[model samples]
Target: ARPQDDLFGHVNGRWLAEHEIPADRATDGAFRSLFDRAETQVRDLIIQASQAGAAVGTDAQRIGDLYASFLDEEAVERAGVQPLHDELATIDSAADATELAAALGTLQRAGVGVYVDTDSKDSTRYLVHFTQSGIGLPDESYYRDEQHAAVLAAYPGHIARMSRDHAKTADRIVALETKLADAHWDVVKRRDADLGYNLRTFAQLQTEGAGFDWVSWVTALGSAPDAMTELVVRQPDYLVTFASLWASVNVEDWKCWARWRLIRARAPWLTRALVAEDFEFYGRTLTGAQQLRDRWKRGVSLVENLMGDAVGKLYVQRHFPPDAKSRIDTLVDNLQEAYRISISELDWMTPQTRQRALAKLNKFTAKVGYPIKWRDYSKLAIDRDDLYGNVQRGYAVNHDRELAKLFGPVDRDEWFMTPQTVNAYYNPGMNEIVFPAAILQPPFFDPQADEAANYGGIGAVIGHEIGHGFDDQGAKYDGDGNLVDWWTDDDRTEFAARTKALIEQYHAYTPRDVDQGAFTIGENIGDLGGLSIALLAYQLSLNGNPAPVIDGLTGMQRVFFGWAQIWRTKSRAAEAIRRLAVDPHSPPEFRCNGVVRNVDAFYQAFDVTEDDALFLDPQRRVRIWN
Candidate 1:
């Protein structure tokens, strides 16, 4: 193929020209296309389960009933606000800050965020890491900036459409969130581990959010009194500010915010009317999705959310071949071997840091396809007749599961994602890279594909996850996954300087005619490192053999093309803008073009010159691992 202005365009222009953003989606890309196919398969699983009438308390029964309940619009509508009466009563009955704290505690079970997670520095312990919460908008900037007036206005409009009385409630919620946002750290600051890891005892937490009943809050959450001894108030000032607002805000205003949040959260599981209204603002207005997803697709999504491993097990049974897992295991080994060699040869790294890097590499645990032990759904009950109740039960199950982690040893066998999810991730705390079964298929990895193509596709992804173990944040954690510094002062300084240059390079990227430098620094670094590592890994795979011509293209050419093809996307203008503001990733175009510009192999393979728009000179390139 003739080279175009950029590699992504050259490889993907034909495909991009052929496909349009699906009416129900915010964007269309290689990832979405594969996901849609997976969605169809999952829909079949749900429909079959629903028809089979599996016995109650079984995984199939839960999946079937959940889907049936969500699809039963008449049952949902008849249940009406009757389903919400219990929850609304809790919010309404909260006459004071003390009661309000209890209400918020209960609501947190149903997707309202309260600071709770495994402590970063001490992975075994659970901490109440309170930051900012209680906002309907995507970010604080939406509430404060004039540029986001449309989205700001739409939020209230969406609320009013749900409940007439909460129209003014939307304004109040925005005002409250704006205050919270003011005290909350921005994206860059929040991304820094040091800024977000403030440790506090239970008494210190009481001091921070004094106006709010900290004891009542934790007790209401059903935490064993002894387990609530320690807390991590990530933003003490924000909590203090929130405590002041909690004391001063009208009780009715608090009810309005809580009410709107509950309604908005439950909108999807409600009647067709509520679901359509929810989509109008969140889908069409917010993300530029032209139509709602088909009911079966939504049901499949719900099943995945509630019983992911159960559904994933069935998916693996049906779709994922054993050979695919075997093939990917080998691919992961190659990527790891490549990283070991790169770490050994890095000129910038000293023996001490290099040894640590190799140690961490040796300690890397790669989870391929699925978990060794699947979660037992025997305990969770699903009611076919009650969608809202089923959803709440789902929340309770998941919340309890997370809480159980605090009592047990950190589970090394746990898989962060289900086998059916079309995604991959690097758990910095786990010191592992995960390749889910769904992402192991076409465009990412194909068992039958040529070595060069697979190297570019899934090989790059494997390298990407491994690269995260060395990214700006991941570098802070040691081989055991504890957040402790292991770098020599001189090595650490040089690493930061190179990362700073990389950050600066991305900081200059003006996509959607907006500067996205700060938003994408971590991911950008990952991209550069991942592609570079994959290039070396691909070379290592070839041993000492000369590059072979596959069809009309050389091995390196095909490798670069494979990388470009996977990132090809056509995104809506609204979604593109929204993603730029809040998403941690650069736009797909940049993911393809940006990283390649930093790779010398890319230039050599494609004959990229100073004349090419994507070219970067040798001196201009930032090297991290080489």
Candidate 2:
């Protein structure tokens, strides 16, 4: 048992201890409540898609075909590795660096390695980004770093077991990944927006390509080389080193690396035996889950992932309520007004900086429930008999759409989340916050909940996304969402000072023998600003009346409890350990405990004494927002 002094454990501990995590799942807590519900809801939708038998190219037909293709275990088992024959032949016969570049591009479209995205700088132009990948283990650390020594030791045997051919090449793949990992940048350096925004024209990229052909690589990845003007070299050093590393490695070893990636990537869709072994390494070794999810669930997931917009099209019509959208939009306006008042009242901020902050907030857009437009699935083909082909086509179609956008204008209607997705996000480049339809339920938003709880629930969420607009990285972009710095010298300085204290606060937490304060500073700032603004917004909702106590708890206490409820969570040991190294968000308990300690109302809500474990001194508290 835990005291209210430690609200996360107090709210979460007992149920977590008693409820065993299901074998197929990784974590069990608040996140799953909505996620599992969404999965069940989506699963029901997929059945309709399957049973409908609508025409060939319609969304229902495409969804049904993909679901059936996945559910047909016997057919896939018969096909075995036959689906990859042609792709492997290309890899097997791949000769020089130029040809290998094309091969690598093909591999990329299948999600074996690198990715393409729209530029953060221009927000309109497209970019091809290369980073450290191709390792079997989670990251480069598993190959060379001492802490991951145990996992690295198991890679060789895992490779030998998975491969029906060339078991001897296990060490070769490991050697290549180790060299690549050595050139990879650390996580903290990777997060700095200013540092990562390295843009170079095609001519310059070719010079850095060493012996490899960037033009052929682009062509193979489905873009005309002549029309490709520029790309974002996210890690210039990594690319320069990798180009050289590419030249230094032998052709046969390169083939080995590609071969392993091919099998590892395709095994899930190939057959039961192949899928089980892949699960052994991925699920059991990586995530610590006991077994694979049900076949039907996996089938539903396959349809949900690649062609989500199609699923989302139906998900919204059936699941999302139009009333919720209108209410949330009202809440968004409330949160933005709260930010305006807070920024105006900041004693540390000058009139000049305050105007810039308020100006930025004025232009911020809030997209709630679902998008006005739906993605056209007319171009994407889904074959009923070919499971692997369906997956390949999905990847190719998505990549093709991205490549087609190289010279196109920015898509104002683009949404990164599906309607059924149980989450929300803020895109700095767009200066916008999006709340998908599925997340707009009970704990996050409920029509019947009291004003204080709603503020602490969805109001805090609304503020968090709004708060992200002013985060360290989000502050880099101006009101227009362009990469422009509008902060005055002293204001920026003060923000940095406050930011440093928050970092130190997070550094004190040692979840798995590491601190992600610097890595997750933006999110930490969002939390700090989010709850404070939630408190203010809740007060604003009261219209200056003294808040009444309900069920022996004051309105203030309910607000704090509402925020705490959102973060109630528990995770598997392995998944928890793994995320601590790579994830930008801190552990769930800290998401609750960490921010509340820094928030002043939390102390006042409970009349927390100085001796209470959660107490922080008045001088030590970090308040960026009122």
Local distance difference test scores for all models:
0.64, 0.64
Q: What is the lDDT of residue 246 in candidate 2?
A: 76
Model 2 TM-score, all chains together: 0.76
Q: Give the Å error, residue 8, model 2.
A: 6.6
How displaced is residue 586 in candidate 1, in Å? 6.7
TM-score of each: 0.75, 0.76
- lDDT string for model 2 (354-396, tens) is 7766665555566664466676674566665666766676776
Q: Lowest lDDT 10-mer window, candidate 2?
A: 112-121
- Global local distance difference test of model 2: 0.64
